Each structure stands twice: as C-alpha cells, then as structure tokens.
Design a binder for this molecule. Sequence first.
Ligand SMILES: COC1=C(OC)C(=O)C(C/C=C(\C)CC/C=C(\C)CC/C=C(\C)CC/C=C(/C)CC/C=C(/C)CC/C=C(\C)CC/C=C(\C)CC/C=C(\C)CC/C=C(/C)CCC=C(C)C)=C(C)C1=O
Ligand SMILES: CCCCCCCCCCCCCCCCCC(=O)OC[C@H](COP(=O)([O-])OCC[N+](C)(C)C)OC(=O)CCCCCCCCCCCCCCCCC
Ligand SMILES: CCCCCCCCCCCCCCCCCC(=O)OC[C@H](COP(=O)(O)OCCN)OC(=O)CCCCCCCCCCCCCCCCC
Ligand code: SF4
Ligand code: SF4
Ligand code: SF4
Lengths: 56, 318, 96, 70, 157, 178, 360, 115
Amino acid sequence: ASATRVIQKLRNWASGQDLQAKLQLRYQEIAKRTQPPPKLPVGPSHKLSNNYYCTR
Amino acid sequence: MFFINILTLLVPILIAMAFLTLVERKILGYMQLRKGPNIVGPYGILQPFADAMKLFMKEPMRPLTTSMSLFIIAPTLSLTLALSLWVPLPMPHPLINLNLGILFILATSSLSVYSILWSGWASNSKYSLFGALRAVAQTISYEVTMAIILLSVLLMNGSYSLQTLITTQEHMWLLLPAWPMAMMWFISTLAETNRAPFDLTEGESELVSGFNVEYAAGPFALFFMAEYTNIILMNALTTIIFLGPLYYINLPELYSTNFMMEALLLSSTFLWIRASYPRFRYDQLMHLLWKNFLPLTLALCMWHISLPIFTAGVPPYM
Amino acid sequence: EDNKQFFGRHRWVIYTTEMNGKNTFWDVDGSMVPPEWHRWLHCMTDDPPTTNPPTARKFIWTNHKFNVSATPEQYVPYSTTRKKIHEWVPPSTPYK
Amino acid sequence: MWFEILPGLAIMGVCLVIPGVSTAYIHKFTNGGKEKRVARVQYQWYLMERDRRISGVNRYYVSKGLENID
Amino acid sequence: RSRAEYVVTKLDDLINWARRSSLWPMTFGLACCAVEMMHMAAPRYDMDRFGVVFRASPRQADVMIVAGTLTNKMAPALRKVYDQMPEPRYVVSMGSCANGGGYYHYSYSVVRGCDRIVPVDIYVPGCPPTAEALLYGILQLQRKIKREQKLKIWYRR
Amino acid sequence: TYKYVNKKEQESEVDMKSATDNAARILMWTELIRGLGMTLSYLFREPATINYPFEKGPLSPRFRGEHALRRYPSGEERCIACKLCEAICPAQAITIEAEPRADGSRRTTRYDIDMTKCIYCGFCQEACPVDAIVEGPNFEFSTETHEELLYNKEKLLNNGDKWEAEIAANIQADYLYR
Amino acid sequence: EMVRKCDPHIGLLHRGTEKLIEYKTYLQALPYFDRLDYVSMMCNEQAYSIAVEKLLNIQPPPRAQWIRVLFGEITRILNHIMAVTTHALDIGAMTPFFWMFEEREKMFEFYERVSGARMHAAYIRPGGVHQDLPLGLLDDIYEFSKNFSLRIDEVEEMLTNNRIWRNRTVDIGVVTAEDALNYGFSGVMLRGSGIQWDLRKTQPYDVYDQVEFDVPIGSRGDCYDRYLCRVEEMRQSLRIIEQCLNKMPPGEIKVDDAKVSPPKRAEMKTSMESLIHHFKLYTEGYQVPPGATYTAIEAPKGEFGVYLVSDGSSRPYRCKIKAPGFAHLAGLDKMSKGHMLADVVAIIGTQDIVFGEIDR
Amino acid sequence: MNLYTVIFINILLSLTLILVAFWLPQMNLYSEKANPYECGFDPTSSARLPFSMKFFLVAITFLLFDLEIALLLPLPWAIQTIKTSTMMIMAFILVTILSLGLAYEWTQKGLEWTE
Ligand SMILES: COC1=C(OC)C(=O)C(C/C=C(\C)CC/C=C(\C)CC/C=C(\C)CC/C=C(/C)CC/C=C(/C)CC/C=C(\C)CC/C=C(\C)CC/C=C(\C)CC/C=C(/C)CCC=C(C)C)=C(C)C1=O
Ligand SMILES: CCCCCCCCCCCCCCCCCC(=O)OC[C@H](COP(=O)([O-])OCC[N+](C)(C)C)OC(=O)CCCCCCCCCCCCCCCCC
Ligand SMILES: CCCCCCCCCCCCCCCCCC(=O)OC[C@H](COP(=O)(O)OCCN)OC(=O)CCCCCCCCCCCCCCCCC
Ligand code: SF4
Ligand code: SF4
Ligand code: SF4
C-alpha cells in the first residue's frame, strides 16, 4: 500500500488487473485483535418446564 | 602482464557468478512474494560465500559402484570449459583474439555436454543415467537448430570473428534485421544452458537431481559454478551478437558499460523465465526444436543466403 | 509498532544485548520475550502491557527465563513420587 | 522491497565491467598507448614483424616516423 | 592463552558461520508436519531468506527434517537416506510422531520416535508444530552448530 | 446444476483476421509474454515476509501451545487430581498419581505429560473442571534431547508460574465462548 | 523412459489408525480424522461427525451446520490450492505454489482463530462444533474471500492458457467414464471424465441443499480437464462461502443434549446435572446405540466414507475409512499406459493424492 | 601461446579446487554412505543394464544433419566469390534438399518416438 503511483501503474499494466483494489496484504480492514465480550445464546432445551428428557 | 589480465578476467567472472546465484535467489523470492537472502551479510551478499565455504568443507562422495576416474574428471572439465568459453569474448577487446570464435564456442559447448554425459555415466545410478540420456536428446535438438541460427547470423555478419560483430553493429543492432532467429537463438541458449523450461538434466521433480544426483560438496559446487558461468556466458554472447553495445574508438568503457547492462538484463530475463514457466517434457523439447524451429531456421537460412545477393550488401571479408 | 505496515510486520521487538547473563548481541532468541509482551507481539490483544498491565500474583516469576536447552540450567525429568515398596531391614545384632 | 536486489545487481555490474575495461587498459599499457595490433591475415602479421624489426628494440609498438628519414 | 589457540577459535567461528548460514535440508517429509514445513517454505517465513534451501538429493543435503510418522515400513528408507548424506549432517525431528510416536505411539507399525533410527540433533514439539516453531528449531540448530568447537578440540588433542 | 469447463459451444468458423490472430499468438508467444508480465508484477509487489524472530505471526487467545498448571490467586494449585485430563487424553500422554496431602487436600504426587506423545488437542484443558491444566501460548520450546520434552509436575508448575501473566489474560478473553 | 508397469507400494505411512480408533472412544477417535487427510481436516471432521450423528439419531443446530459448511468450503479451497499448486510444482512451476500458500497461511489463521490449531482443529464434533466463532471472524473471512478470486485469476493467467501447461496436461491420463466407474473413482475424476455426480448435490448433508452452486464437469478426462474442474470448483467454493457469510443464522453451537454434547463451563461449575454429564462425557463418553452405517461426504479429493459399526458401548467396534485416493492410486497403473516418466508425475499430481488417508 | 597459457591456468584452477575439495574436509565413509541412491531402497538391478532409446532414428538423422551443417558452414567465405549465381544456386539446392529430407522423415513419422 506504500507503493508509488509509478510502480502501481507498472504493476497494474503488467498484471492486467487492478491490484490496488484487492491487495493480498492486510493493513487495516481486518478486525481488531481485542474484541468486546460476547454473550452466547442458549439452546432450545434451556427452559424450566415442558422439557422432559424422555420427550426429546 | 598477461597473467594479470587472466586474473582480472577470471576472478571477476567467478564473483559475478556467485552474485548471480544470490541475485537469482533474490529475484525468484521477490517474484514469489518473499524476500530471499538478506540475513547472511548486509543484504545477503555473504550468502554465496557461505554456500561455497560450506560445500568445500563438506566431505565428497565416492560411491562404490562409481567409476572414480570419470567421476573426478567430469566437474573439473565442466568448470574449465566454462572459463575457456569465457576467454575469447570481446568487451570490446578479447583476452584471446580468435578468427573462428563462434566455432570455438560451439566446440567448447559440445565438450561441456560431454562433461555432463560422463558425470551421469560415471555416477552409476539410474537417475544419473536418465539425466545423461535427457542431455543427449536435448543437445541433439538445440545443437542442430542453434548451428543453423548462428550460421545465418554470421552470414549477415560476414566472418566468424566477434570484433567483426561489433563493427557490424556499429550503427544498428542485429535484433532489427534478425529478430525471429534472435528469439530462436534465445530459446537455444536456454536449452544449451539447461535453464527452465529446458533444464531436464537436473530434473528436480521428474528425477531427484539427475546427472549430479550422486555428486556432493566440492564437485557439486564445480558443476553449479560451471552452469551459472555458462548462464552469464550465453547471455553475454547473445548481447554481443544481437544487441550491439555502443562502440567508440576513443573510449571502450562505454562499450563495457552497455555490454554489462544488457548482459545483466538478459540474465535477469533468464531468472524471470525460470520463475514464469513450467518445465517441458524432454520429447516435447525435441519435437519443438525439430518441427517448429528447424523448418523456419532453414527457410531463414535460405533467406539470408539470398538477401545480400539481391541487395548487394555482401559483408566484407575483414 | 507502525500501523502503516501490513498485518504481521506492524509490531516488532529489538532484543536486548544481554539477558540473564547471556550475551545476546547476536544470539537473539524468540523465547526472550516475557509473556505480556509476548501476547502483545503475537497480537492476541491490541493493547501493550504498559497501558494494560497484567494481574500481579505472588507466584508469578519476576524474572523471565529463555529456552535453557543444552545449558546447565536445562530441565531433567525424574519421577516425583516416593518409594512405594519398603524393604525389610535386617537386625544389626547376631542371633548367636 | 524490489530495490534490495540492487546491491547484488551492482556487485554483478562491477564484476562485469572489470574484465573488459581492464583488458583494454592492459592492452594499451602493454602496447604503449595504442591498441593491441590484430593480425587476422599474413599481411598484417608481416606488417607487425616488419615494425618489430624496424623499431630496433624488438617491440612492434615502438613506431618510427619521419625522424628516421633524412 | 596461546596465539595459535585464538587463530584456531577464529577458524572454528568461520567454519561454523559457513555451515549455519548454509543449511540445505533434504526434500523429505512424511505427513502433516511436512505440510507445515512447506508452510515454512511459504513466503511468510522464508527459509530461503534465512539461507535454508531444500535439495532433493541427500548428497547435497546438510540437515534432515524428519517431519511425520516414521513407520516400520519407512524406517529402512529413512536410515538409508540419512546414511547417504555426507558427514556434516544434522537431524531435526519435527512433531510428536517423529519425536516419540505421538498419536500412534502404541501402534504395531510405528517406530516410537525417529531417535530409535537416526541420531536426532533437535526435537521440535507440536502436532503439528507451527511454521514459526519449525523456524525456531532451525535457528536453534544454527546456534547449536555455532557452538561447535571442532578445530579447538582437535588442537587440544 | 452444472457447467462445462472445457467444452466449446458451436464454432467460430474461419476468418483471415482470426487466423492472423492465432498465427500471431503461436509465433509471438503472447500468453508466455503475459505470464512474464504477471511475474514482473509480483516482482514489483511488496513481499509478505515477516522479520522473524523480531516479528511474529499473529495468533489468537484460543491458541494451543505448551502445557501449564495454574493456581488460584491464593497460590494453591488448581489441580484436584481428578484424572479427567488423563481419561480424555487421546494419546494417553498424561500420567497422574495422587494421595492426600499433609493437610488432607486432594493433590497430585505425579503429573507427567509426554509432550512427544501429546497431540496438542486441548482436550485436557477443556475437560479440566477447575481450569488447572491449560495449553498456554508458548510454542518456541524446542529442545536438543528427547528427555527434556518429558514434562513432570515441577516443569508444568514452573510453566504455569512463568506464563500466568499471559494465560490468565487469554482465559479472560476466551472463557465466555467456552 | 516409457512406463510399462506401475506398482504403487503403499503402507509406508500406515499407522493402524482403525485399530487405535476401535481401542479409543468416539471423542478420542475424532482427532485421528484430522490426520487421515491432513489437507481436508474439517471435511474429515464433518464426515466422522455426520456418521456418529446418524448413529446417535441427533442433529446439530442450524448455526453449527452453517459453520460446518462454511469451513468445509474453506477447507475445499485449501485442498484444491494444494492440489493445483503442487501439481504445477511437480510439472515445474512454483510461483503459484508460493502465492497460493500465502493464501493458505491466511486460511490457517482463520483455523487458529476458531480452534487454536492451524491444521488439526478437532473443531467439528458430533453434535455441532466445539466453540462459537470469535467476533470479527466473519468480517475477516469476507475480507479474505472478496480478494481471493483475483488470486485464482492470477494462477489461471499463469497456467491455463500457457502452451507449456497445455502440452503437459492435455491428453495425459485419459480416463473413460465407464472405466472410472468400474475402478471406483470419485469426485474430480468422475467429473473430469464427464459424469454428472456430486454428493453435495445428489445426497446433500448439513445445509448444502440450502446453498446454491454449480458443478464443474470435464469433457476430455485428462489432467487439463481435472485442473480446470478444480479451479472452477474453487470459484464455486468461494460462491458458497459468500452465501454462508450472508446466511449465517443465530443460535447455539452444540446440540442441546448434555448426554451427547458437553455443557457450557459455567453450567458445569454451577449445576449438578451438568457436572455429572461433563464428568461422564469426558471420562467414558456417550454410548452410541448398536448399529452399522456408511456415511459418505464429498471431500475435496473425492468421496470420503466412514463405515462405522457400534456395539452399543462408548467405543466404536469398527471404523473403516474409505479414501478416494486409495481407488485413484489403484487406478494409477491404468492411467499411465503409453506414457513417460514426466507424464506419470503429472498423473500422480492430478489424482490429488495424499497418503495418510490412503494408508490409515 | 597465450591461449594455451590461459587453458592451462583454467586446468590448474579447477584441479586445485577439486583437490582442496577432496583433501580439506574430514573423511568418514562406510558401506551405507557409499551405496548408490535409489530413493531410500536398494536398487533392484544395476544401472549398467541396457536402457532403451526411443529417439535413435532422430539421433542418426542428427548425424546426417550435423554433416549438412558442416557443408553449410563455409558460406561466409563462399559469398565472397566472383560467381555469386553459382554459389547462390548451389546453396539453395543444398538447403532445399535438406528441407525435403526433413519433410520426408516428418511424413514417414521418423521424428516421432517409438512406443
Ligand atoms: C500433501 O501430500 C504431500 C506432498 O505432496 C504435495 C508432498 O510433497 C510431501 C513432501 C513434502 C516435502 C518434502 C516438503 C518440501 C517443500 C516443498 C516442495 C516446497 C518448497 C519449494 C521448493 C523447493 C521450490 C524452491 C524454488 C526456488 C526458486 C528456490 C531456489 C532453489 C534452488 C535449488 C536454486 C538456488 C541454488 C542454491 C540454493 C544453491 C546455490 C549456491 C551454490 C551451490 C554455491 C556455489 C558457489 C560457489 C562454489 C562459488 C565459489 C567461487 C568463488 C570465487 C567465491 C569466492 C569465495 C571466497 C571465500 C573469497 C508430503 C509429505 C505430503 O504429504
Ligand atoms: C535475444 C532477443 C530476445 C529474444 C526473446 C526474449 C524475450 C521473450 C522470451 C519469452 C519466453 C520464452 C520461454 C520458452 C518458451 C518455449 C515455447 C516456445 O517458444 O515455443 C515456440 C512456439 C511453438 O508454437 P507451438 O508449439 O505452440 O505451436 C504448435 C505447433 N505444432 C502443432 C506443430 C506442435 O513458436 C514458434 O516456434 C515460433 C518461433 C518464432 C517465430 C517467429 C516468426 C516471425 C515472423 C516471420 C516472418 C513472417 C512473414 C513472412 C513474409 C510474408 C510476406 C507477405
Ligand atoms: C581436464 C582435461 C581437459 C581436456 C580438454 C581441454 C579443453 C580446453 C578448452 C576447449 C578447447 C577446444 C578446442 C580449441 C582448439 C583451438 C581453437 C582455435 O581456433 O585456436 C586457434 C588459435 C589461433 O588461431 P587463429 O584464430 O587462426 O589466429 C591466428 C591469428 N591470430 O589458437 C591457437 O592456435 C593455439 C593452439 C592451442 C590451443 C589449445 C590449447 C590446449 C592446451 C591443452 C589442454 C589440455 C592439456 C592436457 C591435460 C592436462 C591434465 C588434465
Ligand atoms: S505429529 Fe501430528 S501433525 Fe505431525 S505428522 Fe504426527 S499426526 Fe501429523
Ligand atoms: S492437548 Fe490433547 S493429547 Fe495433549 S495432553 Fe491434552 S488431551 Fe492429551
Ligand atoms: S482434569 Fe484438571 S483437576 Fe482433573 S486431574 Fe487433570 S489437571 Fe487435575
């Protein structure tokens, strides 16, 4: 992403593809390495009634 | 003073060969989205010396089934013929000035093929035998085609000397009149030097290592030096023949600089081609050089027989 | 760190020239990183252990040790259990 | 980046310009400020041997002009 | 000490520098660990940048990276290609299989660690060890053969 | 549904312009030239090589590395010698012996992990009911002898004491998912 | 250099995997399948998990099924990258190997972020998957996949129209459709010979009947057609990855049945039933009712089958692993008739052969 | 004399390199070290057995074509002749005859490899 415009035009002409739109090196678009804590949902059997195991 | 001239030819060619190995590693790495050697030395520049020292301090192999005499004889023969092929090139003044320079080149190249063949037969192994037979087929195809190519080019040039080629390209490159046979000569030099896609003797994936699969350490280093010196040699021959550097009588340093730049560009093109293409099959190489290159080479040889006759541009004898 | 660099090369460490009495001017080691900077350097979190220090415990090592293989400080395995079968000790006085 | 190749390329360039330049300078030094004479034919070789005999020092490159003619 | 001892130590340093800067592994692998080995060859880690380049023939190899499960049917072949390597040779066991059998330790057809067959210089643990860990093992081997004192021991003989 | 990867539909017939284009393609090596151009573009790109060991590849808090035995904040060992890790270990890489301690606590007298036998699967750390055994994120612990990878309780407790500043943070970042 | 006979001696990577599996429990036998086909780890996990779930008569939750399909397609991309690029490396070109292995490194980062292991995840389990996805993983998968087709276009530009590659691959190892059916080929071999067959379309599993994709079909049955099929189904795998990212549902991760899947750690540490079930699942394991099944899954290398026989206990009585590479390598000698050494190298490359699943 | 000197210098340099390569490193050779290489297993048969050649006809044709090259090589001095018409006709006849031989072999499948 630090390539000069001359080298970018040279690479794009040599490959035939617009390489700068789809770079194979990740710079900033990736997720942050620290994330907010999750709160995972519970399954369908997490209920206090009508949940006898013989019926499922 | 002549011995000093021998030294200042031989030693810089060897250092240029070693840094050609380094620059192949760097260029292949940067074409393969990696870096290549930059740790051993400042920018990797001590890596070839490290490799040379490691190979010359590793023990050599002397297999029980192996014919010792030819096993020893082949790598030193290969290195001597590489340096001998280097000796008569004019930049713009050769160390040894010959009349039949390209004939000397052809003879020494065929003898280098014999070095490969004797290595493959002496190393009594089946992969070495495969490498020797593939070398036989390869040199058959490129020998006939390259001989006709060089014949047509020198028919345009007029003599077998190479200072005569400098004088021929004083005003214009031979690439413009002879660019189809320049392409065929480039492919022939690839096959002569055993570079991808026409390597086929040090077959990494098909064989294990081919003709030098039983060679280790020092003799293997000699083979590698001979091959890469031949790479720089054939690219130097290509730029002397086809891409004529600017020659001025008052200063030859401009010729040496232009020759160096074009030879570096052609060597980098060799590394570029090795990166780009997959390997041929060795019957397809023969079919190519005998069915596509050879008929066109014969036609262009007839054309270059006719061309000075009907243009009255017959080249001078001297 | 340098966030203009791409992912992977955006954080780096210049190792010390000496750690635990070993001259690491050339012999740099990947295990010389203490665990908190190891987490930041391997990018499991975005914050360094200067704005977010780890929890202090009294049993946590105050001095990090690198890989001590092929050194006198290396680890040697042994059975950590005591003897299970106890042999009978003969008396030290003769019968006659 | 791609310019890390340039140190090895520069070493190759110096090691390729050394042989030709050194050969030209050694030819000039050993032939006394002139290029080494090329005898591609017997006529040119005879010219070189005649110059060697004419010079009187058994060196062909010591040319004699009009100072030898009265 | 003696002046010749210093010269011998410097020659030892030079030889060790050459041998650790030029480490060519045999193109030899057995399993998933060899998949991680070519992921070390991959552009992220660049063993070629470290000076480490695969060679197919064991005659041109310096180190042997045993990367995978060494079986009973494979053990004579592994010993053969180890023996065909020239003398300054090293062995890097990679992964739990090559270290001590691993997940197939109690199998009828698995050698319980390649150290029963070849002398192993460096053990790299993992299943698979990451390419980072294999590169760490390679650098540790470079340090180990930097520590070698062959000419100094020869002089002290 | 399906599609054809090599079958051609109908024909393009024959034309002088098309014949000349195919002739130029065969003679002038056009696809070979554009392959060269692709490699040239890659040459002028930026390499994806990190500067190991000064730069490390990214990881996650879930990463399964070198084993360690943790403690409570009081300093008491978390392990209660329940042998669930030994029972679930797919490689049988864990050996556990135990007895009541001098204070009557249920503690191990032998906790060995054969790291040459272990497959680094995390079943021990996900079967441990008290988060005693963990796979801390250390992976650069290669040794020069086979013996040094045969860990015992002292080695595992030393690893837990060494890596507690990082293991606790990883478990803090991870435990809501598990 | 002509090849008169091929005799593939195998078993040099045989480790008695089926015997060890029958001596271990089901959860203990799960990470063997990571090491059967060590390029298709999640796919073998999915195959074994579907076999055990069929024997257990339980189904994973829909979010687990969508995660399993997404990672199966990521694994298919990984395996076809390995197949195509190492085939090209055996032919002689290594630059696509380096580029696509950088891409493989990114997908290994995805594997490590979900499971903690780059290759042997042991993530897909009977009842679903082990853990939920960490936050931002779907965004990173999208960022990878939106740029990946350009890299495929790069390899395709490098190889597909190259006359050298066409000479090396066209009319090499030609297999007729009837011969492929009789030799028992599956996956890429049948579709290269032109047989319209894919298990994901014919006998779908998880939510492959809900995703939409095309099946690449060859017409000449050679190495070039098989290579084109692998590249095109890499593109189709990218298409399925996009669909999975857009249609990932909310919900749980394991089946809500603590007698098969372990409970959450908080529930285990706060509840008696959850602690008992955690203890029994991680010591004895769940008892599978006795019965035999053959579960076949469209692995990237072909049909990956598990013939599981359960005697009613918590350990499998018998576990036969059917690998496509076994039948393909059995058929290697037929494909190499009238060919040379380099042609044999090309055929071994195009058969998509890994030896862990062959030898077991 | 100079060419002979530089050839001898190359010979001495390569002999010195191979001599120091054989006498400098430490020797440790045994039977398994020096057994031939067959990818880890013993060779089934010796490598001195007959090894079939599928391009033998192309090799014989290469002999004849190489002599055609030897005939064509004095052309750069032949073009200096007074009677350029005779030289041009003879060169055309030679190259045409060579091309007709190549075309006949291509038609009769001699360039194709056996089996
Ligand atoms: C899934 O299934 C499986 C597979 O299937 C896919 C497998 O495959 C498989 C097996 C797996 C493996 C074996 C892993 C192997 C890994 C790979 C195949 C990927 C790695 C890729 C490559 C090998 C391709 C590399 C490509 C390159 C371009 C790199 C370049 C390499 C080269 C060999 C060329 C460069 C040359 C060298 C490095 C050596 C050059 C240098 C010298 C020899 C030095 C010579 C110089 C001198 C002697 C000069 C001396 C003279 C002087 C004057 C010097 C002056 C000196 C002074 C001291 C003054 C397994 C197990 C498997 O399960
Ligand atoms: C030194 C100077 C520069 C040289 C070029 C260097 C840069 C380019 C390098 C490219 C990479 C090469 C890597 C190796 C490639 C190997 C493959 C290969 O080249 O195969 C050869 C290919 C082979 O093609 P093919 O094999 O695909 O074709 C199929 C053929 N059959 C079916 C028979 C098998 O091409 C040639 O053989 C062409 C050679 C050059 C021809 C040039 C003709 C020019 C025009 C002449 C005049 C026309 C008009 C006449 C007058 C009309 C008047 C009206
Ligand atoms: C390891 C063993 C290797 C054995 C093989 C060695 C190969 C050497 C390199 C390849 C040689 C190929 C053949 C070359 C033959 C001569 C080529 C030539 O054209 O020479 C002519 C030239 C001068 O002639 P011309 O160009 O007409 O100039 C006249 C006006 N200037 O120059 C001359 O007239 C000079 C005549 C002599 C030139 C050749 C000298 C060879 C020296 C002997 C080498 C072998 C020594 C024996 C083995 C030693 C131990 C191994
Ligand atoms: S240690 Fe694990 S990853 Fe390595 S070869 Fe064995 S099973 Fe595969
Ligand atoms: S990670 Fe798996 S194999 Fe290793 S000790 Fe834990 S349970 Fe055993
Ligand atoms: S599972 Fe945990 S508490 Fe139980 S024996 Fe193992 S480490 Fe100790």
